[PDB]
Amino acid sequence: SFVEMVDNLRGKSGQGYYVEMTVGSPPQTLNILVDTGSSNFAVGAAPHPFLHRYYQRQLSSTYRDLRKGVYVPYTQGKWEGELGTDLVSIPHGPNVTVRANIAAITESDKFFINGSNWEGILGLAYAEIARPDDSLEPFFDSLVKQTHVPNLFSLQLCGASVGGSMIIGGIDHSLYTGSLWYTPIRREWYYEVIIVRVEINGQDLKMDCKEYNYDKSIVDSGTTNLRLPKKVFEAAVKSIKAASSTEKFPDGFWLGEQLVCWQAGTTPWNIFPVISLYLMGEVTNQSFRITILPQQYLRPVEDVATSQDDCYKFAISQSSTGTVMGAVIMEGFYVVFDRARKRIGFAVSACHVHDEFRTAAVEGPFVTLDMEDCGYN
Ligand SMILES: CCCCNC(=O)[C@H](C)C[C@H](O)[C@@H]1C[C@H](C)CCCCCCCC(=O)N[C@@H](C)C(=O)N1
Numbered sequence: 001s002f003v004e005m006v007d008n009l010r011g012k013s014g015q016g017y018y019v020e021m022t023v024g025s026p027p028q029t030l031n032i033l034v035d036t037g038s039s040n041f042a043v044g045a046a047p048h049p050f051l052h053r054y055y056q057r058q059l060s061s062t063y064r065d066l067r068k069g070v071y072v073p074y075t076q077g078k079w080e081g082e083l084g085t086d087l088v089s090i091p092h093g094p095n096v097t098v099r100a101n102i103a104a105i106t107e108s109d110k111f112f113i114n115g116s117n118w119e120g121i122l123g124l125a126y127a128e129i130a131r132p133d134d135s136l137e138p139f140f141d142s143l144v145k146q147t148h149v150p151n152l153f154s155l156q157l158c159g160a161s162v163g164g165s166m167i168i169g170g171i172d173h174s175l176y177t178g179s180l181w182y183t184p185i186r187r188e189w190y191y192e193v194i195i196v197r198v199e200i201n202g203q204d205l206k207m208d209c210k211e212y213n214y215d216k217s218i219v220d221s222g223t224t225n226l227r228l229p230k231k232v233f234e235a236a237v238k239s240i241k242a243a244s245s246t247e248k249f250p251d252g253f254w255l256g257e258q259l260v261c262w263q264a265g266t267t268p269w270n271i272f273p274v275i276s277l278y279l280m281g282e283v284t285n286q287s288f289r290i291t292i293l294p295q296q297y298l299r300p301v302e303d304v305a306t307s308q309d310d311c312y313k314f315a316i317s318q319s320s321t322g323t324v325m326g327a328v329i330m331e332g333f334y335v336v337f338d339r340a341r342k343r344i345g346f347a348v349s350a351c352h353v354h355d356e357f358r359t360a361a362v363e364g365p366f367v368t369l370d371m372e373d374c375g376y377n
Pocket residue numbers: 014015016033035036037038039072073074075076077078111121129130131220221222223224225324
């Protein structure tokens with residue numbers, strides 16, 4: 001019955017993917033952003049210039065107040081509100097209803113996005129990072145505990161205004177090609193994984209692999225870019241710069257502060273390198289790799305002015321809180337969050353965006369010694 005969930009995600013490029021949900025009785029319809037980078041379910045519950053609608057507790061007969069405040073800070077954006085519970089369901093998801101924790105957003109800062117079309121957020125990670133603390137059971141945990149929905153979900157994010165699928169409770173084989181490759185969820189808080197090697201156009205960056213996970217490495221559908229720790233970010237940009245030297249860039253471009261353009265249909269993709277991220281595998285000394293095409297880290301940005309050229313923004317940015325594999329990475333694949341078996345699977349997506357002479361891929365197996373040493377402690 002997964003076909004009913006295919007194509008249940010929508011969104012605007014760079015503004016997150018959202019799924020439709022209903023909260024309260026009678027059911028209140030809202031678009032909720034899917035965030036594997038957090039664990040709190042929250043919805044705008046008070047007027048806001050960027051919100052077209054919001055959760056109205058006074059109109060729901062099943063709403064229960066928990067009489068507790070809550071605040072949640074993200075890499076960018078934050079909100080605070082009032083905790084409570086209410087009945088929730090997903091129209092284009094499993095046919096079930098569950099009572100879950102809901103944070104009614106009363107105040108926010110740089111959280112809601114103008115014209116994004118979503119009014120709430122669904123944190124799909126674990127209770128360990130839930131606010132105010134791990135006692136606030138996350139939505140998916142509640143779903144799994146109250147219903148017969150298996151403990152896993154998969155995300156198929158399709159880039160270029162964007163669409164995709166969140167298959168709740170299973171894997172839909174019609175959405176990917178080739179084999180699924182699994183990497184262990186290191187610890188159950190963020191969906192933390194371990195990167196064991198990085199190559200750019202087939203050349204190893206040759207850094208201590210701990211640097212790749214310096215602090216941590218997570219998979220986050222709620223982050224647009226591929227975010228890399230300082231040292232790693234610098235090595236990558238240096239490499240990407242050198243490979244594309246035969247072109248001129250505003251330099252602010254490499255910081256994501258300025259976009260580059262080219263005459264329509266003349267983008268020199270061939271000069272931008274593919275990036276291969278090797279992830280720890282399921283067996284001893286075994287890993288696999290996923291390769292990223294420049295069409296993924298060069299996010300298209302429409303030019304409101306003279307819509308004659310194709311412009312793009314560099315979607316790889318520096319981080320101080322570890323590596324973040326955002327939409328830039330996920331859009332190229334079918335990603336399975338197999339909580340039950342504590343692993344995350346990757347497979348080439350059916351909606352992959354491949355160029356003409358190169359192909360995004362998930363390949364294995366590779367042999368890699370001392371992978372455990374790649375994890376930061
Ligand atoms: C409270 C512990 C968990 C905190 N988790 C996070 O902060 C994760 C890593 C980031 C979240 O996914 C947040 C989720 C944000 C609020 C909402 C999605 C907004 C659409 C994408 C906007 C551009 C973007 O890329 N935002 C990143 C920088 C971001 O902060 N992402």
